[PDB]
Amino acid sequence: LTVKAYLLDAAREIRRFSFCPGPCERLLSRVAALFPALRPGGFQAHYRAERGDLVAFSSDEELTMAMSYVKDDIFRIYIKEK
């Protein structure tokens, strides 16, 4: 349940936290509460595919999609600002 959230080109701020009322909603609320410059609806979540490419998730579906794609034992997240 180990999360490492990269605020983004390159990484500009990195925040780490644990995380197990939708999943995607709970996580995006965790991310919105942890990054001072972030407010709800103001950002886009991403994960990386095995090919390396960034891909937006925005629902519970695309979230488990993202999780399958994360095998480290560490779930990685990439946030862009709208």
Partner: peptide, 17 residues
């Protein structure tokens, strides 16, 4: 990676890790 901690929760995660 430098990881910013601006809360108890983040400090807690740094401790765990």
């Amino acid at each position: 990676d430098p990881c910013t901690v601006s809360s108890q929760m983040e400090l807690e995660e740094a401790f765990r890790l």
